[PDB]
């Protein structure tokens, strides 16, 4: 099951107010008009890759979808968060809670905090140790799938957990419709209005329309010719061609000679027909100081 | 909690304590002669009181006195590459006072630990709790140390009997990142009343300048702090005293 992710998934890269100005940034969004997977909520919770993020959407009428667990192992082996709302309190903890055999909510405790008609979009992520809760509730008159429309997704609360997530599993309520778009380090033409709601966005590395859109810094491009980037035939492999040298070089000889010359008569040992690895040099930890002036101290091998 | 503390973390599991909802004065830190090295290229030491910061994290750990230049942008070293990486664009100020008499004991302060083996370089400000045995040779290592099997997380020994080059030294990254998050740790300066239609030297949350201050009708969202023009210069602000 596939879906055309029409316009959803735009949020605030930052929450600094801007007016009638188009800001371009590199950030993690899912592409517009892209392929996203379609799920149902009958009798499905595989552990999808949250490589850098996904966009969640819910068609809800009785508050069935209620939480998430994100992480790298998600089995209390790593720090993993659990979300429950018991009709009065918001509870987001990564503490060592007792998870069920199949993780559900009914119908290393370092982070020391202890306490259709609706579309709900939630993006829980980590960028540089910030945990951004992204939330939006939107009314609609549509039943078939996710609606077509623009919705800025704003931060609410930033909490100190700073967690590795590379693959995620959704949380069910036992006695979840969602979408998975792989985010990429892509550059995005973002539009702010005078009231401060992000009204539109462009994934501008996608198609020629969008490439012109973010090279011309405009959502409307005139008819014409525009250079956008550079095309280079990428190398498919690496070829190394060196002389057929067969003798290990006496670098060890000028390290382990029986005598060394003074500064009054130091020697010029000139070297040809050799192989120099320098890996034994770097593997030797004897170096008291290594001030390597022309060439890299590490990058020489 | 970060200076007069009873317990300091190590470089493998250094505490990343968000410091927020408090007043950061720094004046007692100036008056303290306890610091020996006060190095940072990001901010200045002495002219810091007038600035109000985004959010400050105190990275608490212990490394050697010769290793104090390793906590720097672009420095390459053993601990710098296996325990704690500093980005090239690092903003913030690292403080290293002398720990001649604090983080040491007669038998050896044996609770400070550090990684020495890794097959990859570290990301900035990462948290690696990897407890696998590093593989030195090509033989598979079934938890059995010995030949081609050594464990990376190495410890120190701190005794007052040890030499001053091996004596424990305290280095702490009070990481002063000025990032997007709302300012909460301002200087110990008294506030003044607000003036309109008259240009005045303003210092709003550390940002200095001159200009006129009139009320605005824009609905800044909660957690929305500044309005920047095309020049990213502050065009509008929300008063943090009155909304």
């Amino acid at each position, epitope marked *: 099951a596939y879906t055309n992710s029409f316009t959803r998934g735009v949020y605030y890269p930052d929450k600094v107010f801007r007016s009638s100005v188009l800001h371009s940034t590199q950030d993690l969004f899912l592409p517009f008009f892209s392929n996203v997977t379609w799920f149902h909520a009958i009798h499905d919770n595989p552990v999808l890759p949250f490589n850098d993020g996904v966009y969640f959407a819910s068609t809800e009428k009785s508050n069935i979808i209620r939480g998430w667990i994100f992480g790298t192992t998600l089995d209390s082996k790593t720090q993993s968060l659990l979300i429950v709302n018991n009709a009065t309190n918001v509870v987001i903890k990564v503490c060592e809670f007792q998870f069920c055999n199949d993780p559900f909510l009914g119908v290393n405790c370092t982070f020391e905090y202890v306490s259709f008609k609706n579309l709900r979009e939630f993006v829980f992520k980590n960028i540089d140790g910030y945990f951004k809760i992204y939330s939006k509730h939107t009314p609609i008159n549509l039943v078939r799938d996710l609606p077509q429309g623009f919705s800025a997704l704003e931060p609410l609360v930033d909490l100190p957990i700073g967690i590795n997530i590379t693959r995620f599993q959704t949380l069910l309520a036992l006695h979840a419709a969602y979408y998975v778009g792989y985010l990429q380090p892509r550059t995005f033409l973002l539009k702010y209005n005078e009231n401060g709601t992000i009204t539109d966005a462009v994934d501008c590395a996608l198609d020629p329309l969008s490439e012109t859109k973010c090279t011309l810094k405009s959502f409307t491009v005139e008819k014409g010719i525009y250079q956008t980037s550079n095309f280079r035939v990428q190398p498919t492999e690496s070829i190394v061609r060196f002389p057929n040298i067969t003798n290990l070089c006496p670098f060890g000889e000028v390290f382990n000679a029986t005598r060394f010359a003074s500064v009054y008569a130091w020697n010029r040992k000139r070297i040809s027909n050799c192989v120099a690895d320098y890996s034994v040099l770097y*593997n030797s930890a004897s170096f008291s100081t290594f001030k390597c002036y022309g060439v890299s101290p590490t990058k020489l091998n | 909690e970060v200076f007069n503390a009873t317990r300091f973390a190590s470089v493998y599991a250094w505490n990343r304590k968000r410091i927020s909802n408090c007043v950061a004065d720094y004046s007692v830190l100036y008056n303290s002669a306890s610091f020996s090295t006060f190095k940072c290229y990001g901010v200045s030491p002495t002219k810091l009181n007038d600035l109000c910061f985004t959010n400050v994290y105190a990275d608490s750990f212990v490394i050697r006195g010769d290793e104090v230049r390793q906590i720097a942008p672009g420095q390459t070293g053993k601990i710098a590459d296996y325990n704690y990486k500093l980005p090239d664009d690092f903003t913030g100020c690292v403080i290293a006072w002398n720990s001649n008499n604090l983080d040491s004991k007669v*038998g*050896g302060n044996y609770n400070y630990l550090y990684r020495l083996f890794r097959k990859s370089n570290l990301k900035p400000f990462e948290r690696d709790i990897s407890t696998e045995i590093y593989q*030195a040779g090509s033989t598979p290592c079934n*938890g059995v140390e010995g*030949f081609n099997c050594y*464990f990376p997380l190495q410890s120190y020994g701190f005794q007052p009997t040890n030499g001053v080059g091996y004596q424990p030294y305290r280095v702490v990254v009070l990481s002063f990142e000025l990032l997007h998050a709302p300012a909460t740790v301002c200087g110990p300066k008294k506030s003044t009343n607000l003036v309109k239609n008259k240009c005045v030297n303003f210092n709003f949350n550390g940002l200095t300048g001159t200009g006129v201050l009139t009320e605005s009708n824009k609905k800044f969202l909660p957690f929305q702090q500044f309005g920047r023009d095309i020049a990213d210069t502050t065009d509008a602000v929300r008063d943090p005293q009155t909304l």
Partner: antibody
Amino acid sequence: QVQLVQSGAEVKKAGASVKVSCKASGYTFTSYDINWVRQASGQGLEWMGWMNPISGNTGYAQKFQGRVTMTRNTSITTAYMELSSLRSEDTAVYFCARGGRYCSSTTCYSGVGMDVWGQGTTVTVP
Amino acid sequence: VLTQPPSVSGAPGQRVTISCTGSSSNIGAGYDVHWYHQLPGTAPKFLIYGNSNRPSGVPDRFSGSKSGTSASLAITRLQAEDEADYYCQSYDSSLSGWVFGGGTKLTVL
């Protein structure tokens, strides 16, 4: 600068257990792996296994599997070889080893037990 | 012991390649063989590890060579005073971590 203290001469009944100590403290012990090696009276030496003071590694050998466990008290880093439900083959002088290579050197060379411990004997006679 | 002149009566200078027979895991792969020596009159102070790798006061006359199924260390300059106890240890891989044999002894007549 390696300092080494152990238990003394003792006699114990068959089937008993010992809470033996192999106590290293007071220097840069971290570069050294405090392993375990024995020798019988008049025989060649034999290596029981390793104990790694470098933050918590465990791994045994075959000749005393099922009879011995090990733990380390990382505060002052006391080494153990817990002879529990003792048998006939442990009546000898029991010593520790010390992995002599420097661990901040990346090359994993041989263990050099340059300094050797005091004494340990569980003689099982009636 | 592994196949050497296992326990002979030897004066200090006997040019005896006191060997240490190892398999392909030991003679070829385990080239970091070290020689313990529980010395008569003190706790083992071998002062001879990594074959010819020497501490202070130790001569290069203990030559370490791997030849087929045979290790080597020897001495020179025949004298009377070097009655001592020798041991060879190899990384035996599938066996315990590093294992000796039977207890090589050097003694004079």
